[PDB]
Amino acid sequence: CPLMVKVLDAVRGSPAINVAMHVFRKAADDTWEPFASGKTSESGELHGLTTEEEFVEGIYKVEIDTKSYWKALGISPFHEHAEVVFTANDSGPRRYTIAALLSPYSYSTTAVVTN
Amino acid sequence: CPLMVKVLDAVRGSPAINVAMHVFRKAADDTWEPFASGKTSESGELHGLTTEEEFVEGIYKVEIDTKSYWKALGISPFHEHAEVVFTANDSGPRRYTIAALLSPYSYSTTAVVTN
Amino acid sequence: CPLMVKVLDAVRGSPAINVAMHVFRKAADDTWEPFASGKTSESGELHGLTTEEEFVEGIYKVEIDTKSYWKALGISPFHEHAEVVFTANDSGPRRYTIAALLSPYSYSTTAVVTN
Amino acid sequence: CPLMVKVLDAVRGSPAINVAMHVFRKAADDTWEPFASGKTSESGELHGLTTEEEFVEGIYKVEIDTKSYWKALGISPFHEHAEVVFTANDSGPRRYTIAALLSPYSYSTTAVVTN
Ligand SMILES: O=C1C[C@H](c2ccc(O)c(Cl)c2)Oc2cc(O)cc(O)c21
Ligand SMILES: O=C1C[C@H](c2ccc(O)c(Cl)c2)Oc2cc(O)cc(O)c21
Ligand SMILES: [Ca+2]
Numbered sequence: 001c002p003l004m005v006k007v008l009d010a011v012r013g014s015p016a017i018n019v020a021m022h023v024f025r026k027a028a029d030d031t032w033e034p035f036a037s038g039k040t041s042e043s044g045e046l047h048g049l050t051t052e053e054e055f056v057e058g059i060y061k062v063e064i065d066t067k068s069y070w071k072a073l074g075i076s077p078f079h080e081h082a083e084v085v086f087t088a089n090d091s092g093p094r095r096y097t098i099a100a101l102l103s104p105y106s107y108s109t110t111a112v113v114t115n
Numbered sequence: 116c117p118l119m120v121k122v123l124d125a126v127r128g129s130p131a132i133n134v135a136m137h138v139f140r141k142a143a144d145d146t147w148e149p150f151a152s153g154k155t156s157e158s159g160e161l162h163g164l165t166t167e168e169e170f171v172e173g174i175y176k177v178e179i180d181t182k183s184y185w186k187a188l189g190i191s192p193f194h195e196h197a198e199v200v201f202t203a204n205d206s207g208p209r210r211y212t213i214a215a216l217l218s219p220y221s222y223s224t225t226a227v228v229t230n
Numbered sequence: 231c232p233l234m235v236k237v238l239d240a241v242r243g244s245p246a247i248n249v250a251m252h253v254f255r256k257a258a259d260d261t262w263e264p265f266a267s268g269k270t271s272e273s274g275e276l277h278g279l280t281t282e283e284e285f286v287e288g289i290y291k292v293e294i295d296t297k298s299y300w301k302a303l304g305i306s307p308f309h310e311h312a313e314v315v316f317t318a319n320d321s322g323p324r325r326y327t328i329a330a331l332l333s334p335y336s337y338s339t340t341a342v343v344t345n
Numbered sequence: 346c347p348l349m350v351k352v353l354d355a356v357r358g359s360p361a362i363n364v365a366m367h368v369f370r371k372a373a374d375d376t377w378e379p380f381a382s383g384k385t386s387e388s389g390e391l392h393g394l395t396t397e398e399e400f401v402e403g404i405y406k407v408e409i410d411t412k413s414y415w416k417a418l419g420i421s422p423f424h425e426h427a428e429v430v431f432t433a434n435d436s437g438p439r440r441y442t443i444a445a446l447l448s449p450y451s452y453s454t455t456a457v458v459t460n
């Protein structure tokens with residue numbers, strides 16, 4: 001699993017379940033092409049987005065639909081979504097875990113990159 | 116000053132100085148048109164991006180060039196930039212302060228919305 | 231003002247107002263003696279805790295009563311308080327701003343140390 | 346495993362390995378009694394601190410020795426340690442995951458509480 005996303009809810013102290021996200025990859029013409037999508041599980045994790053072979057060097061964007069998450073909980077949040085944009089595999093294949101910690105008016109995101 | 120951006124550096128414990136950013140407003144064709152830009156001051160702040168009359172309801176994106184900041188410090192970063200996408204809404208007088216706390220592999224962003 | 235504390239609320243997108251805090255200085259017998267205290271203003275800030283002459287090198291602890299804050303808002307919190315423990319060091323003129331961003335089950339704290 | 350701690354390094358984008366921490370439990374006389382200790386593994390996690398039977402209701406403090414971690418990497422950080430203080434099991438047994446994201450001048454901590 002070369003790309004995994006974990007989302008946590010800082011209001012409830014729980015995984016953020018059923019959070020939709022879309023991954024894009026920058027094309028040679030500088031447009032964002034769709035790459036993968038899914039939603040987080042009961043553990044707040046989304047696995048299986050891509051494979052080692054398909055996850056080539058490039059600039060990737062993970063768009064996490066945080067607004068829909070908060071609205072379903074009755075909360076009108078500040079952000080439309082959380083965006084994570086990064087260059088991947090520029091020094092060879094790596095495994096990426098992208099984590100997001102969500103509050104209505106704030107989020108934090110980190111990356112753990114392993115060889 | 117209806118919109119201010121403040122950027123902090125979590126490695127140095129300092130304002131993040133000379134950080135470039137661009138602000139975009141979402142157009143009707145779902146594209147991002149440039150709206151304002153600047154670089155942070157010695158206090159890590161960027162003021163004067165817009166005026167009350169110009170800052171109408173809509174979806175705005177603040178793109179903070181964090182990669183160039185870490186590059187100038189000789190530190191290898193994860194993100195291409197930090198993106199803050201939000202809806203500005205008219206409900207009484209509202210001033211928006213977007214704050215971002217930067218680390219090489221993580222960032223946090225919050226919004227302080229006041230009257 | 232060599233020491234200022236700023237507290238923000240990530241659920242409401244606002245300064246965290248009327249948050250009590252106590253500052254302690256570590257004594258030679260490894261106990262915490264009270265040094266200063268106050269409550270945050272309507273801007274979420276607490277100034278005037280100490281003076282340049284009094285704020286000598288040592289280990290300091292800022293205990294922020296986050297539990298009482300969330301209780302007053304009717305929101306069940308995780309932490310009893312938020313603790314910030316640090317060494318103040320003389321290396322040129324130094325002003326310390328401790329910032330804390332509060333959510334019910336999470337907090338973030340940073341230090342901005344300037345001249 | 347009713348109590349687990351995970352520590353991440355926001356400068357390197359990696360688990361924070363070999364981070365020492367000590368857990369204390371508040372006694373009836375309001376002193377902090379030692380409860381458990383250990384260090385994080387290669388995955389940045391510390392498991393096996395306690396058991397369901399031993400982890401009774403009470404106020405617990407997790408003291409994470411972040412200063413020693415940064416110093417071994419050549420960095421002089423701001424904080425002496427990261428402290429996480431919380432009431433546990435007040436509504437019956439729960440499982441607690443305490444996470445800390447570390448930077449030299451900042452840290453974030455969250456809790457995931459499961460039934
Ligand atoms: O608005 C903020 C929030 C910001 C902040 C952002 C993310 C974080 O995780 C933390 Cl701890 C703190 O700190 C600040 C420092 C400051 O001098 C003035 C400010 O307005 C802020
Ligand atoms: O990987 C992480 C990191 C995440 C996190 C994200 C942003 C943050 O600011 C903080 Cl503190 C923590 O917390 C976690 C909680 C958990 O149960 C299992 C995990 O793997 C993580
Ligand atoms: Ca390459």
Ligand SMILES: [Ca+2]
Nearest residue numbers: 172204205206
């Ligand atoms: Ca309206």
Ligand SMILES: [Ca+2]
Nearest residue numbers: 287319320321
């Ligand atoms: Ca000295």
Ligand SMILES: [Ca+2]
Nearest residue numbers: 402434435436
């Ligand atoms: Ca009870």
